[PDB]
Specification:
Oligomer: homodimer
Bound molecules: a molecule of 2 linked components (GLC-GLC)
InterPro entries (chains A, B): Maltose/Cyclodextrin-bd, SBP, SBP_1_CS
Largest sheet of chain A: 7 strands, mixed
Family (chains A, B): Belongs to the bacterial solute-binding protein 1 family.
CATH superfamily of one domain in chain A: Phosphatidylinositol 3-kinase Catalytic Subunit, Chain A, domain 1
Shape of chain A: globular
Distance between the termini of chain A: 63 Å
Number of strands of chain A: 19
Protein name (chains A, B): Maltose/maltodextrin-binding periplasmic protein
Radius of gyration of chain A: 26 Å
GO molecular function, one term (chains A, B): maltose binding
Subunit structure (chains A, B): The complex is composed of two ATP-binding proteins (MalK), two transmembrane proteins (MalG and MalF) and a solute-binding protein (MalE).
Chain lengths: 456, 456
């Protein structure tokens, strides 16, 4: 028996391996920590083919998609264990009423600044250009951060109204995306103007921003707790504070709960459970990871209470409360690819802000569906159809499906409909002109449950 | 403005028209009560084309479907009014969290018997053949009831294991249908044998059975409270009692809550509300209807208490307690059509019991969908596909749909996935042989969430 763990390369993987060593000492079970690039993207393929890790660490947003596809083992910790972690952290790793991972720590981005360059950091994003111009006369810049991952730019986009999926009545609506509204637009435009006026560069990534900050070349960066360890070993005298406002509004970072899921195909699930409950999620376990790269606000009450007085963590939590806990619904992956695309294109000039976000809006609503009711004589049959795709793309196979569904329907209630008959088929509302085939159901203004017929 | 009301022709429509005349007297608003044949089948088509009644009366089972398709207005009685009816009746008219009709009364089938022909009615279905021989010697028969509508045969079909859709933790599973299991077969076979052995006739419908019982030609019938009025005016001395057992188990009638829905296109929604709240659902209103044809155990607490003492209503409730409240899910009507034809065909000998029920099982089960996740490169996309239809029927348009949904996806993530076919498209699990195109997802053992790829 053995445990293979996947964790991101920016986290305390060496510290986690120390917890692994201790576990091995006590049980004979070897633990191997790995940090492959794009592990959150690779996990589905490998997990499905029996090649995945036994345990995967990532922020909770990815785990809904994994769970929906059966990739993660349901977690059944006793109430004694559940009590040891904050309740809102368990909420982050619940999918369809089941717990699907162990929560580890709460992460939010903060503003990190160099006290020697910048004794008083700006309250507002709008101050940055003037500050940069002043700093440029001394061979420095105001602000550098990773522009290749939308995680980092989201706080600014959401500040004046950008949102991912509309939440209400317990539910996220994947048809209602907030990536093209006025707020998101104003946020991204502000970022792109920073680039145009040479206050930032479109190609700046994680390592470039981190090096600039840790070498005293830029006055500010935006990052999470994991980054503090490299800043400590550097010269820099730094603080961690609330993100700047934009148009008077707090920056609203998406908050992640670093979580550990168990592969549903692991041959060693019981050992994974014992490793995480009795070794990792202890004061001693989290200390070993946190000492390598800080976790932020850990989900473990006893240790959280112990670190809470650290001002860097207090600032993490201040930024967290101003932000939003990420959804964990499956469509988050598609949201993130869309926003990533939109930020990168707009920043580089390949697309205008309007065009980038309009496309992202389109795409984040991946395969939204509309339920329609087909009326065939007196028989009604519900169909789930793509909302945004033109009707002509799927009408033929849809008529063939209905044919098979209704084949044993008694003919009295069928109204004489014969789907085997030849035809140029189209949808129509009863007593109305047919819907044009080159439109989607959305284009046609069709709501869930709408009654439709077919006509030839 | 006027109110046009539809109610079934077995109900107290003259009594209801009397409540109508009182409303007209007080308000000047004319009320027209109509009882068209098959009104529950007609309602969707006419309602969608602006020709429906303002108010429709039917058992609650139909109203989920009407509501899903926007044909019913949302009902907003204040709490004072809601407290006047039993909570369980409101539950019956709740669809997706909204009240969609006013509940009027609880209806269950009972056994009705001629006390002069049969002082002690049988406790078991199994007794009926021998009882019928005795009664034939006297020119009479034992039992006659409507065989043309599955409502009346369902209690027997359900006794030893028949069910419509399996229910558990809050939700009905339309993939899990109980129409062709051993219990349902057992029940329906018993019925078909009564007909083979000449204890009943397959052609017997509602009027024939009613006429025979009310003339004193048959010792028993099976019917609901609406029927008692015609027996009262007849010379028959009758009792209403618990249905007989089958294989030692209670007959389980499907219980309906007769309910009044308001048409979403009614130009007179407020008038219908005042009529239903302040005129029908009062002791005086319900009494007027009940005096024409009995309603059963009414939803209005004040009047239900007044009539509870009546042993005919107590027997109704006893039968209701042994049975089950009907689902109001939209799939109910399709279920009913399938079972209707299945019983008629077995009873006539046109098909065997096994083949009739197999077809109704397949017909009620063919509406279901399965959620799958398609992996293209490292990108996952959820699709909602028909569960019981062969994959080949919809694969081509499905691939075309997916191509359109993915066309603005960034390419690094699609990992060189080739969208142009090397011949026939097929689904496959990651790293596994393809699924057979002539099978459904159900045949292939695919559950909700399954990770599939596309291969050619
Ligand atoms: O950039 C989109 C990306 O954002 C988040 O990923 C974070 C992660 O939560 C942190 O733990 C940290 O490692 O940085 C990542 C961003 O580079 C989402 O969790 C992730 O799903 C999403 O793709
Ligand atoms: O036979 C199937 C039929 O059953 C029920 O209809 C009942 C109705 O509930 C009663 O009020 C009474 O009038 O008799 C009907 C049977 O003829 C369901 O309510 C109906 O939806 C279904 O088609």
């Amino acid at each position: 028996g053995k445990l293979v763990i996947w964790i991101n390369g920016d986290k305390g993987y060496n510290g986690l391996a120390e917890v692994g060593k201790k576990f091995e000492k006590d049980t004979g079970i070897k633990v191997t920590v790995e940090h492959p690039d794009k592990l959150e993207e690779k996990f589905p393929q490998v997990a499905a083919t029996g090649d995945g890790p036994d345990i995967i660490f990532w922020a909770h947003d990815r785990f809904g998609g994994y769970a929906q596809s059966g990739l993660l083992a349901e977690i059944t910790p006793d109430k004694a264990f559940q009590d040891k972690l904050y309740p809102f952290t368990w909420d982050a790793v619940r999918y369809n009423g089941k717990l699907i991972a162990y929560p580890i720590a709460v992460e939010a981005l903060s503003l990190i600044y160099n006290k020697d360059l910048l004794p008083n950091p700006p309250k507002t994003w709008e101050e940055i250009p003037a500050l940069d111009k002043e700093l440029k006369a001394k061979g420095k810049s105001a602000l550098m951060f990773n522009l290749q991952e939308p995680y980092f730019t989201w706080p600014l986009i959401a500040a004046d109204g950008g949102y991912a999926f509309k939440y209400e009545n317990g539910k996220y609506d994947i048809k209602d995306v907030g990536v093209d509204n006025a707020g998101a637009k104003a946020g991204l435009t502000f970022l792109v103007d920073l680039i145009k006026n040479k206050h930032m560069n479109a190609d700046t990534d994680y390592s470039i921003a981190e090096a600039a900050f840790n070498k005293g070349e830029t006055a500010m960066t935006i990052n999470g707790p994991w980054a503090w360890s490299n800043i400590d070993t550097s010269k820099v005298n730094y603080g961690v504070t609330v993100l700047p406002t934009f148009k008077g509004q707090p920056s609203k970072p998406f908050v992640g709960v670093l979580s550990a899921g168990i592969n549903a195909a692991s041959p060693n699930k019981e050992l994974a459970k014992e490793f995480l409950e009795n070794y990792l999620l202890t004061d001693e376990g989290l200390e070993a990871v946190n000492k390598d790269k800080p976790l932020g606000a850990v989900a473990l009450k006893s240790y959280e209470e112990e670190l809470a007085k650290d001002p860097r963590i207090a600032a993490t939590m201040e930024n967290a409360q101003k932000g939003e806990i990420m959804p964990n619904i499956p469509q988050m992956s598609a949201f993130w690819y869309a926003v990533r695309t939109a930020v990168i294109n707009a920043a580089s000039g390949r697309q205008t802000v309007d065009a980038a976000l309009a496309a992202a809006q389109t795409n984040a609503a991946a395969m939204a569906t509309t339920r329609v009711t087909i009326l065939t004589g007196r028989r009604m049959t519900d169909l789930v159809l793509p909302a945004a795709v033109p009707m002509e793309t799927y009408i033929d196979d849809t008529v063939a499906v209905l044919s098979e569904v209704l084949e044993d329907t008694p003919a009295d209630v069928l109204g004489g409909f014969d789907f085997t008959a030849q035809g140029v088929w189209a949808f129509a509302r009863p007593g109305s002109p047919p819907l044009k085939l080159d439109q989607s159901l959305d284009d046609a203004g069709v709501v869930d449950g709408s009654l439709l017929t077919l006509v030839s």
